[PDB]
Amino acid sequence: QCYFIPNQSLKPNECQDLKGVSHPLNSVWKTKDCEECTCGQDAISCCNTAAIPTGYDTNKCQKILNKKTCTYTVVEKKDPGKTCDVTGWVL
């Protein structure tokens, strides 16, 4: 249920996670019904309620929920721009 990754940024004023997340520190935000993310001065807690990408062969990619339009995206550890292999999404 949800997860939390320790702030790896050595700058006490930023927030980064996986290979797609990466923005300056500001505060804690929580969508009304799409995604949830908080920036703890000691760690970062983020959760996802939207459907989860399935049929995705767990080879070496990462899953990220785009709170911009409530959608599920997937990038690659060595390609923070190109989407990895996807198939669909299930509740």
Domain parsing of the chain, residue ranges: 1-91
Of 27, 2, 23, nearest to 11 (Cα)?
Answer: 23
The tokens for 14 are 């930023």
Of 40, 30, 32, nearest to 5 (Cα)?
Answer: 40
Distance (Å, whole) CA 38 – CA 47: 9
CATH of domain 1-91: 2.60.40.1900
CA angle in degrees (0–180, nearest 5) for 28-84-21: 20
Cβ-in-10-Å burial (0-12, 13-18, 19+) of 29 comes to exposed
The neighbouring-strand residues paired with 30 are 36
